[PDB]
Design a protein around this ligand. Sequence first.
Ligand SMILES: O=C[C@H](O)[C@@H](O)[C@H](O)[C@H](O)CO
Ligand SMILES: [Co+2]
Ligand SMILES: [Mg+2]
Length: 387
Amino acid sequence: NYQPTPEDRFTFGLWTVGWQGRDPFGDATRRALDPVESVRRLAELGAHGVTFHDDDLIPFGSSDSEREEHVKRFRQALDDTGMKVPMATTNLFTHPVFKDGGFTANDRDVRRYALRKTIRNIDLAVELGAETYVAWGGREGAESGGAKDVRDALDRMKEAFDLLGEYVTSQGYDIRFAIEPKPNEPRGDILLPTVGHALAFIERLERPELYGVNPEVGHEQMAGLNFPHGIAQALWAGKLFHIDLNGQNGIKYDQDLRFGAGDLRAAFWLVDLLESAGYSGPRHFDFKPPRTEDFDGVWASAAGCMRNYLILKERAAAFRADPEVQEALRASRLDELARPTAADGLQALLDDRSAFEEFDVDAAAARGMAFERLDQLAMDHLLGARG
Ligand SMILES: O=C[C@H](O)[C@@H](O)[C@H](O)[C@H](O)CO
Ligand SMILES: [Co+2]
Ligand SMILES: [Mg+2]
């Protein structure tokens, strides 16, 4: 049961199944993967498409000649399988030139180089059919308080994204940008550390309609925040352009576990939210098969990502469709939350004596919210103990 088909819109980064397992304390445990091979292996598992960094597909320092050979064979693999490329991004973190950042490096010449490297890959992304261009500023930040004037850094960050929007606008490209937040690692503190900081920042850009967020389960969980709550606020603002799905076990290093691992109940409430809201973008997996695994374990880990989404989707549909759950939701007054507080208006509210002078505060205090019975019904459905 629970088999993925291209209609489920599951996508994967080339850097995910392709991670060789080199972490801070150890050397790589797997051989490098050919991107053509990843495309074919992922198509056979039922994936909708792939994503990439420029440096995943074209090795850094490649001439214009070698570049076109790498793009050509990749394209052939896409043409042959029907795999899509819905999203692409730039590597502005691996090479030592970016050790203090790309867009917010203190050195001005590095910031201009960062912009040129990005613009080049946007042209390629659009050619391949990508609709979202992701920016993760993993090197934008500091280890010490005096190294970075954060107000000046935000001016430089705003300058770079405005320039990018002017570029896609002048070229007539039908592509949008999505900022991916992370609170720390590899820098001591990273700029725009959460979904909220990223949403606020977009509103100061010159063309705010071109920019949204690409939140990641584990990144918000590295700050101890409620990921479904943060997704709700991004949807409320009309800014959920893309999403990165994986797992994370609490506040620690970025684990990038397969989706469904880590905080399982949060994964259930996330899937409930994405499906009931009708999110229609890619279900992208940004995970790392643990370096304990050989290549058989890499493909099993990837399949597990899609399988866990499909199970949770089924459990959330059953939860919502259960008449007993619908009764529970009315008993907890979820339906009154959808009602305006004072659609009668400010003057009516001020003259309404039942809202203050004659409000029976003790009777309203004594009402039970009945939240625990509702939560146990959610638990029963998740576990298939009444589904
Ligand atoms: O290893 C890859 C990054 O750490 C990942 O978090 C970003 O999603 C990627 O750069 C795409 O922007
Ligand atoms: Co991560
Ligand atoms: Mg990510």
